[PDB]
Amino acid sequence: GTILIDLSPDDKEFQSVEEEMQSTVREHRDGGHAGGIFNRYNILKIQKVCNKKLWERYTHRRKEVSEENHNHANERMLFHGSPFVNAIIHKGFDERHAYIGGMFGAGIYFAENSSKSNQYVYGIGGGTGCPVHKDRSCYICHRQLLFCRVTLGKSFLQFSAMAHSPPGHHSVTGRPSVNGLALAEYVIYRGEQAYPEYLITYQIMRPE
Ligand SMILES: Cc1ccc(-c2nc3ccccc3c(=O)[nH]2)cc1
Ligand SMILES: [Zn+2]
C-alpha cells in the first residue's frame, strides 16, 4: 500500500527537510569510522512516504499516548538510518527493526543529528560499508535515510556518555553528558509510535 511521491527541489517542504538534514551534521568520536568523513551531503532526492494503513496505525497510537499524557503526544521529527529502510517504508516499524544491543535496551532508535543516523545505513558500526566498494566512507554510492514523525509521550531521561518502556513512560531520551556538541537520541519500544514520513537519497561529500 506504499507509494513514494517525489518532492521538487523548489518545494518549500523539500527545502525545510534538506535544511534539517544538512544543519544537524556533526563530528563523531570515531573520527568517521562508522559513517565516513564529511561535513555535508549531496541530496539527490526527497520522497514523501504515503501509506494510509500505516498512517492510521501511527495516529491511533498517538491518540492513546496523548490521552495518557495530558493531551500531549510530544511528537518530534527525527532521523533513522537502517539496513531495513526498504522494509520499513512498506511494512512499518516493528520489533525486527530494533537495535537489540542498544545502550537503552532493545528498541527502535532515532537521532536529532542526521550524521548519527548515517552511521547505521550500512548496519551497526557501519557494518562493512557500501555493498559495491566495502567502504564505510564511500563518496560514490547512494545512501538512504528516513526523516520520521515520532511520538515520545512521557520520556524517561538518561544522562549518558523489544524491551518495555520504563514504567510510567512511553520512550527513553539519551541526553549527551560529555560531548557538548552532540544532540539527543531517542528510543521507542512500540513500532506504532513512528511513521517514516520522508525517504532521503544522498551521498556524503568529501571535505575539500
Ligand atoms: C539494526 C539497527 C540497529 C541500529 C539502528 C540505529 N541506531 C541508532 C542509534 C542511535 C541513534 C540513531 C540510530 C539510528 O538511526 N539507527 C538501526 C537499525
Ligand atoms: Zn560504494
| Total domains | 1
Sequence of secondary-structure elements = EHEHEHEHEEEEE
Total strand segments: 9
**CATH class value:** Alpha Beta
Instruction: Count helical runs.
Output: 4
Q: Taking strands numbered 1, 2, ... along the chain, how are they ordered across the largest sheet?
A: 1-2-9-5-3
Helix/strand structural class: alpha+beta
Shape: globular
Under CATH, the topology is which? Phosphoenolpyruvate Carboxykinase, domain 3
Q: Which architecture name does CATH use?
A: Alpha-Beta Complex
End-to-end gap: 43 Å
Chemical compounds bound to the protein:
2-(4-methylphenyl)-3,4-dihydroquinazolin-4-one, zinc ion
Major sheet details: 5 strands, antiparallel
Percent of sequence in beta strands: 25-35%
Helix content: 10-25%
Rg, alpha carbons: 17 Å
What is the assembly state of the chains in this entry? monomer
Organism: Homo sapiens (Human)
Subcellular location: Cytoplasm; Golgi apparatus membrane; Nucleus; Chromosome, Telomere
Domain PARP catalytic: 8-208
Protein name: Poly [ADP-ribose] polymerase tankyrase-2
